[PDB]
Design a protein around this ligand. Structure first.
Ligand SMILES: [Zn+2]
Length: 182
C-alpha cells in the first residue's frame, strides 16, 4: 500500500491554529468487521484520501465504499483520522448522514485533527454526524503517532510532535465536547 510523504502528514495534521491549511483535507481510514464483540481488522481496506478537483475527501471516501465489497449482513466500523472535521455547507455532513441511514451495516468513528470552523455551520455538521450515529472526537498525541506509524512513509523514524500538540488537542476537545454535549 502507498504511504504518504512525511511533510504532507505534518503540514496537514498539525493542530496549531497559527498554521494555515484551510485549502486541503487529508483523510486516513481503516475498516474492521465486528463479529459478536470480536474485531476483524481488515488491512486490505486502509488508505488515505485528499480533496480533488472540488470533491471533498469525505465524499471521495463514500465513493469508494462499494469497492470495499462489504457484506451487508455483517457489521463494520470505519475509522477516519481526518485533518479537518467535516463541513456542512458543501454537503459532507449531509452526505455522511444519508450514507449511514442507507448503510446500516456501517458504523463510523471520526477523529479530527482540527475543527473546520471556517464553515459557519460547523456546529451543525458535528451535531448531524453525532445524530446519524457517528462517534466524533479530537485527535490526541496517541492518534497522531498512530497515523504517523501507519500511513506515513517514515522509514522507521519516530513521530516528532509539533510544539503545543497536547495543549491544542485538549482545547479543541473541550470545544467539541461542548458542541456535542448530550
Ligand atoms: Zn466537506
Amino acid at each position: 500500500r502507498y504511504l504518504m510523504d512525511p511533510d504532507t502528514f505534518t503540514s496537514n495534521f498539525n493542530n496549531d491554529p497559527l498554521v494555515l491549511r484551510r485549502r486541503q483535507t487529508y483523510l486516513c481510514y481503516e475498516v474492521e468487521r465486528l463479529d459478536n464483540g470480536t474485531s476483524v481488522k481488515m488491512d486490505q481496506h486502509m488508505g488515505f484520501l485528499c480533496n480533488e478537483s472540488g470533491r471533498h475527501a469525505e465524499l471521495r471516501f463514500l465513493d469508494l465504499v462499494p469497492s470495499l465489497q462489504l457484506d451487508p449482513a455483517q457489521i463494520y466500523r470505519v475509522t477516519w483520522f481526518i485533518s479537518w472535521s467535516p463541513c456542512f455547507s458543501w454537503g459532507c455532513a449531509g452526505e455522511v448522514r444519508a450514507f449511514l441511514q442507507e448503510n446500516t451495516h456501517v458504523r463510523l468513528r471520526i477523529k479530527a485533527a482540527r475543527i473546520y470552523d471556517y464553515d459557519p455551520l460547523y456546529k451543525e455538521a458535528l451535531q448531524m454526524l453525532r445524530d446519524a450515529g457517528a462517534q466524533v472526537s479530537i485527535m490526541t498525541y496517541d492518534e497522531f503517532e498512530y497515523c504517523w506509524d501507519t500511513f506515513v512513509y517514515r522509514q522507521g523514524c519516530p513521530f516528532q510532535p509539533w510544539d503545543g500538540l497536547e495543549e491544542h488537542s485538549q482545547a479543541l476537545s473541550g470545544r467539541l465536547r461542548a458542541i456535542l454535549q448530550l
